[PDB]
DNA sequence: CCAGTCCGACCCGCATCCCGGA
DNA sequence: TCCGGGATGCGG
DNA sequence: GTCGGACTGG
């Protein structure tokens, strides 16, 4: 009775939610599935309407998925144990089984999205290049655009059917609130093709991505943000270069110039890799996050399956910074589980987790193993681990986007 | 052989909801 | 009541 | 956002 409530079947007391279908970048299908199972001494058991309000003794609940390419190979993840609910101690609380559906139901929902197979939701062009410039961005007929980076929220703008204006985000989440953006974008659509996407930034200079990101998720906010665009594309004509695109884009600027929370981002033209990392230091004395470097004959290459264009590069510095190592745990779902993490200590004694990076899952696997707090205590605590990350946070002095490299020594 | 894709884990900060005890 | 903690799901 | 790993497509 309970498994209805749950979209899709149930064999061999494995439930499948129904496939996720979506387009590779070469054309090929792929299909995507999430099985939950409960494992109990080493096998697998049926799942019973009981099993959602008492846990069974020694029984896990696992959720795994499965992804192929059409007429491809089976990949199968390894199992996300789910071996005890969640606010176990009041009212809300769930059971072992029901917790892993309620989680397998969640990624099943999730996943739906950014993918390519809609309401008009384009997700926006990612960049794959970092600190890099390929040779061939000056191998084109034209030089290659540079832009300010800015520490914000990423956001695409279109109109629907009705007058309404469409903001969403990496993820094709739509945006709320923004209405200091959204009235001026719908004056901006009275003068412009209204089948063009204007791709931007959720931005304020000199607030922190923290207040930025806060002030577009939060379902009201103070309408103190500004949206900078900085390219544009149509649906039907992606494959439109870049350079093309950002000479439309001005054109559409000039149509109106009675904005005040709307820009169009400064372009600038280079010859080489000099004059881009000139930019790039020139930027980073402004305050700003970097410059973005896009090849003059690049497509607009939507983020279907997070796909990162290879026309794009993202010049940002690369902050290192040491800290003081004072534990070390493990992640908890699929091949993360038993894999080692660490644990840094801040001056104001605030702690957090590093993942390790240039470390390969059988090292991570091992180091977690051979390891107790005994051992810990006598060797790695108190070391200086090498942090890469992008910022510091700046309420608690934590890196953000960090990863360990490795020790001095 | 070798990049190109794609998935699936993880990090911190914020926003929002349900709780349930000073 | 109202301020937390837990859980979830966004952003980077 | 970051990353490693496995498959893809030659």
Redesign the pocket.
Known sequence: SMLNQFPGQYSNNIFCFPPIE???????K?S?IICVQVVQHNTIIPITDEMFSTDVKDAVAE???????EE????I??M?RVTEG???????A?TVVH?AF??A??KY???A?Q??GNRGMIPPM???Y?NIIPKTFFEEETDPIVQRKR????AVACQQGDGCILLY?????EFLGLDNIKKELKQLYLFIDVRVYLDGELYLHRK????I????????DSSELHFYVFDCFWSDQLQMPSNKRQQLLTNIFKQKEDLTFIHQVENFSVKNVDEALRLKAQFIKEGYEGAIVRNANGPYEPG?????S?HLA?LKPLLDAEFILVDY?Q???????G?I?WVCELPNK??????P???????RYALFQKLTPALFKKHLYGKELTV?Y?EL???????????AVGFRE
């Open positions: 979506s387009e590779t970048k070469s054309g090929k792929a995507w959720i795994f998925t499965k992804f192929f390419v491809g190979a089976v990949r993840s390894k996300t969640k606010n176990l101690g009041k009212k809300n769930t917790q309620k989680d139901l969640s929902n999730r996943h999205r993918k390519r990612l960049v794959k970092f520490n914000g929220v990423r985000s990496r993820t094709e989440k922190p991505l923290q207040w990101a806060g002030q577009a998720n939060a379902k009201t279907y399956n997070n796909y990162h290879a993202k745990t992640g908890k779902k699929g091949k993360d589980l894999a993490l605030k702690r957090f987790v590093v993942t990076k240039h470390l390969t899952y059988a090292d890469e992008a946070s700046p309420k608690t002095g934590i890196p953000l986007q960090a990863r």
